[PDB]
Amino acid sequence: DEKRHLYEALLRHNYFPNQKGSISEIPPCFSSRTFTPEIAELISSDTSGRRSLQGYDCVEYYATRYNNFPRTLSIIHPKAYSKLAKHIHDNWEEIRFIKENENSMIKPDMHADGRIIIMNYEDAETKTIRELNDGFGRRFKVNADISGCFTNIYSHSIPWAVIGVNNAKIALKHWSDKLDYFQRQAKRNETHGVPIGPATSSIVCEIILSAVDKRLRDDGFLFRRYIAAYTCYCKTHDDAKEFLHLLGMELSKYKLSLNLHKTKITNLPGTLNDNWVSLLNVNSPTKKRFTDQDLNKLSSSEVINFLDYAVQLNTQVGGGSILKYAISLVINNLDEYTITQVYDYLLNLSWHYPMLIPYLGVLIEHVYLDDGDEYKNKFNEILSMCAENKCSDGMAWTLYFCIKNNIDIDDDVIEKIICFGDCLSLCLLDSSDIYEEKINNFVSDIIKLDYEYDIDRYWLLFYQRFFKDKAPSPYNDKCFDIMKGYGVDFMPDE
Amino acid sequence: DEKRHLYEALLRHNYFPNQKGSISEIPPCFSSRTFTPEIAELISSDTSGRRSLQGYDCVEYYATRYNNFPRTLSIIHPKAYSKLAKHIHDNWEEIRFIKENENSMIKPDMHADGRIIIMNYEDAETKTIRELNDGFGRRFKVNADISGCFTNIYSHSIPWAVIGVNNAKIALKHWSDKLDYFQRQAKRNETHGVPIGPATSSIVCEIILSAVDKRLRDDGFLFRRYIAAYTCYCKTHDDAKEFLHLLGMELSKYKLSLNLHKTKITNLPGTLNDNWVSLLNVNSPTKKRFTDQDLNKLSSSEVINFLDYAVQLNTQVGGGSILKYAISLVINNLDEYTITQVYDYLLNLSWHYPMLIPYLGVLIEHVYLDDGDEYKNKFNEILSMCAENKCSDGMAWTLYFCIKNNIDIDDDVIEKIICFGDCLSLCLLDSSDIYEEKINNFVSDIIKLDYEYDIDRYWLLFYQRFFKDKAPSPYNDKCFDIMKGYGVDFMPDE
C-alpha cells in the first residue's frame, strides 16, 4: 500500500535527515530502520511518565553548505516523533493532496529505496525537457525564496492551509489541529519552526505551501517550487512583478515572507543549470563516455588539473557547490595511479571545505591507510578543525572513517570533540567504548542539570547507552523501554 | 530619578517605535505620551476578563529600509505591555547593569527628550575619536552580525543571561523568569522573538547580549556593539578569527548565531564611516558652513546636481542609505527658488524609494499645495504604490500628509488602503471620519472572525474607535476602559 509505504518512510528511512540522494548528510553508521511503525504505535499508546517541560527538544546537527555555512538539521525525539508520524499516517487520505500538486518538484512520492522525500532525484533528461518546455516563449525568469521556511513556519497555520484561514480561526477536533499540536511537540512546544530533515516537517511544509501553489496556479502562473524556491517563467515583466506581489501576499497570509536577498529577475534565455555547472561540465574530462572502461579511466594530470580548475572556478564564481559537483564528476572513474594523488587533494579540500569529507569514504579501501601515520595525523587535524569550526557533518563523517578504518585518534582532539557537544559525534565515541569515562562525565553533567531539554538534545546518546546497557534511561516514561525491548538500534550493523 | 525616567521612557516615549532620532519611522500624529506609568499600574492591577488565546499579538508596521526591504516593527498590546514595563521598572536596580556596559553603544541612557533608546545619537566628533582610538595600532577590522537577533532571541534565555545558563536551568520566582514570561506575553506567548521598536525589547536584547559582551571583554577583545552588530579591532588575523569563534560560542550558548552573509574582515586603515558617506560628504555642496546664511543658501542647479549624483552613487554602490544621507545634507538650507524643484525631485525619489517619504514633511508648508491638483494626484499615486508594495511607513506618512494638508484622497486608492490592512493606516482613515463605513466593515470582519489575535493586531484601531465613542471595546477586560477613563489617546493633538 501507499499508506504503509509512507508509514515505513516516516520512520525507517526519512526519520533521520536523509533528503539528499547522492551523499547523505549523516554517516551510514546512523540508520533509522528497525524503528518500525509498530514500535511507533506502541510508543504512541504509552502514557506513562511525567514531564516538567512542554514538548521535546531535538538532537542537533550542523551540516556544512557550499559556503561553509551551518544548517541545523534535527533528529526529533522519538516519543514526540512516533505520535507525529502515526498521526500523518492515519490521516493520509486527507494529506495526500500534496502529492497531487504539480508545482512542487520535491514532495512525498513512492521512491524505490523506501524514502518519500529525496531532493535532486529526477533524471537530467526530464529536468532539461521541463526547463525548456516551461521556458517556451517567455522573456523573464523570476527566482524567489521563502526567507526562513524551516525557521519560521507557523504551526497554527497548518489548519489555515487545510480548511482556509478564516474557517480555521472560526473553528477555534479536526485532523490538522492535532497535526499542528504534534508538530509543535516535536520542537519544544514551539509554534514557529520545523525540525529540518524528517519527512514529517517536509509534509508539514508541503501542506502549508500547497495552498500558495493553488492560488498561484489559479491565477495562471507558470511556476515551479523546489522546497522553498519559486521559479516563474514570464512572458513580460508585468507577470514578473505581479507573481512576486501575489507570492508575497499568499506567503504573508500564512505568516511567511520572501527572501529578498534571493530575489532576482533574469532575462531568458538564461542557463538551464547554473553557469558554473555548464562551465564544469564543458571542461570536465569525463564529459564523454567512450563505452570502453580503459578510455573512461582518467590519468593523473587530467584529474588534478580539473580539480585545480574547479578550485579557481569556485573562488571566481562561488554561486554553487562547485567542488562537490566537480568531485562527483571524476570520483568514480579514477585509475589506480590517481587514487593517492586525488586522495591527498581531497584531504586538502576536505580540510578547507568540510562538506567534502563524505567523498573520503569512496577512496578509503583503495588507499593503504597504515603508511607512515600520515593519514593518522590528517584525520585528526581535520577532526580538530571540525571541532574548531563547529561543523557536525564533517565531525561525524571523519569519526565514521576513524572507527571504520580503525585509525587511532588523539586525546587532545577528543578534548574538543567532547567539548563541542555534538550529539552524533558523542554517539560515535560512545560506540567506540574506549572513551567510556569522558562520555560518562558529559552525560552526568547533562543529568545533574535536571533540564529535560538537554536530555532531549542528547536523547540519541542517552538511548544508545541505555540500549547498550552502559547506562539507565534518563526518562520516567516507557518510550526507551519499548524501543529497547523490540531491539531499536540507531547505530545498527548489517 | 532614573527609575522614574525609565518608567516614563518605556511608555510615554519609547512604547511606539521611536528609536531613530533624525526622522521617526512613525508619523507624529501617533504619539504614546499620555500613556502615563500610573495608567500602566492600573492596567497591571486589573485582573478582569477571560482570554481564549495565550498571550497578545501586536500592531504590525512594515517600515522600509534603504534597499526597500520591510522590517516589521511592532506596537505591543498595552495590557501585555503595561505589565512588562512595570516589571522592568520595579526590577531596575537589578537591570541597570546593562547601562554600565561599555561595549554597547546604543543602550538605555537618560536622554533629554524623554527616551532611553536612540540609535545614531552620539555626535560625530566623539564617534570619530573613538573610531581612531580603537583602531589604534591594529591590522584588521572584523564586522559580525547576529542573524535574526529580534527574530530569534530566546526568551527563556533571559534568566540564562542574568544568573548563568546552568544556574537558571537548575533553578527551574526570580525576577528574570517573570521578565521572560512578561516578554513572552507581549508576542502571542511565543518563546522566540521580540517586538521591534519598544524599548522593553531593547532592554531584553541588552540583557542577553551583555553576557556575550562580558565574556568577549574578559578575553581581552577590543570590540563595540551597535544593537546586533559587533565591530572588532585586531592586531593580527589570529584575533580576527578567534573573536569570530568566541562570539559564535557565546551567541550559540544563548541560542543565537552569527549572520554569515554580514561577516567580513577588512584590513585597516579602512573608512571611519562607510565609503559612500565620505563620497557624499566630499561632494556635498553644504560641506562648508560659511557663518553667513546667504552663502549657506544653495542654488537650484547645485542641489539638483548633487541629488542626481546621489542617485548614481546609490545605483553604483548601494552599500547604505545614500539617498537619505544626501537629502538630509541639503534639506535644511534650501533657497525659496529650490523648494519646488527639490520638492518634485523628492516626489520622484519618494515614489521609487518609500522610506524617503518623511522628508516630504519638511517642504509641505513652503510648497503651495493647491496648484492645479498636481500634488493631489502625486500623493494618491504614492498611496497606491505603498498599498501595492505593502509598505507601512510610506503609507502612514503619506496619509499624515494627506489629512494634515487637507488634500483629498481618491476612492480607488482607499480600496487598497482598506485591503492592505495596515493598522496604523486604518487609524488615520479612522481619525479622518469620512470613511467611517469602510472602517466599520473591516472591524466587523475582524470581530466576526472571533480570533483574539486579529483583534490584538488591530488593537490600536479598536481602541481609537472606542475612545472616540464610535465603537465599543472588543475586550471583556477593563484595560481599554481604564485607558479611556484617564484620557489615553494614541492619536493626540497639542
UniProtKB/TrEMBL annotation, chains A, B:
<protein>
    <recommendedName>
        <fullName>Reverse transcriptase domain-containing protein</fullName>
    </recommendedName>
</protein>
<feature type="domain" description="Reverse transcriptase">
    <location>
        <begin position="1"/>
        <end position="311"/>
    </location>
</feature>
<dbReference type="Pfam" id="PF00078">
    <property type="entry name" value="RVT_1"/>
</dbReference>
<dbReference type="InterPro" id="IPR000477">
    <property type="entry name" value="RT_dom"/>
</dbReference>
